[PDB]
């Protein structure tokens, strides 16, 4: 064949730290379907947002948003343990069906995204060259996000511990911990990985008695 009907750009969803995770690659022939399992970003997360994206960039913010829906009712669990099955199906009419299903709760939500959605032909060529020009920056972004997500997890866990600790934790331990949480949050907004890891460190150093209490 000299002609093939294809989805012209990658389709996928936003995942923790502003990353696009691809479910269908660019140039895949239609009809097609694919599924992948995802989980929650934080302990006890009760809902997830499925932000559907078209584009070749690893930064979610630089891809074309197609729609979004939430899936609620995820039962309490440590982060990474729920199994949220995401399915993208493009039918022969170019209609995109996306669903998410929580295997423990049985709950499911879905959206339909019509065939004319997303980028037009001019924008598709633009998107491809932009991802090529930004290949190496996007590889560094993905590294930055791995570290930001670790930092985000520590911030969350430590804060839950502060709460649960109540008065068992001495007041000057709490003062130092709050300062170190703020400094870690500030660092998370930068693009320097070492800077983030250094604040995680400064936090852990003021956290030993709290680690003892929690334990």
């Amino acid at each position: 064949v000299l002609l093939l009907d294809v989805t012209p750009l990658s389709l996928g969803i936003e995942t923790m730290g502003g990353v696009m995770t691809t479910l269908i690659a660019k140039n895949t022939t239609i009809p097609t379907k694919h599924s992948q399992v995802f989980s929650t970003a934080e302990d006890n997360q009760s809902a997830v947002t499925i932000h559907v994206l078209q584009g070749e960039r690893k930064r979610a913010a630089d891809n074309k948003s197609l729609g979004q829906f939430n899936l609620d009712g995820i039962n309490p669990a440590p982060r990474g343990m729920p199994q949220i099955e995401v399915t993208f199906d493009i039918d022969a009419d170019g209609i995109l069906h996306v669903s998410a299903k929580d295997k423990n709760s049985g709950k499911e939500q879905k959206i339909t995204i019509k065939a004319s959605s997303g980028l037009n032909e001019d924008e598709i060529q633009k998107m491809v060259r932009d991802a090529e020009a930004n290949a190496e920056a996007d590889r560094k972004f993905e590294e930055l996000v791995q570290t930001r997500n670790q930092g985000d997890h520590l911030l969350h866990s430590t804060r839950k511990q502060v709460e649960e600790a109540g008065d068992k934790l001495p007041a000057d331990d709490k003062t130092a911990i709050e300062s170190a949480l703020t400094a870690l949050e500030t660092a998370l907004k930068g693009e320097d990985k070492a800077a983030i890891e250094a604040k995680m460190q400064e936090l852990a150093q003021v956290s030993q008695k709290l680690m003892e209490i929690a334990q």
Binding site: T15, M16, F38, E42, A47, V48, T49, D72, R79
Partner: peptide, 8 residues
């Protein structure tokens, strides 16, 4: 598995 954000 990659992780998903909660609703804002």
């Amino acid at each position: 598995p990659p992780y998903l954000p909660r609703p804002r």
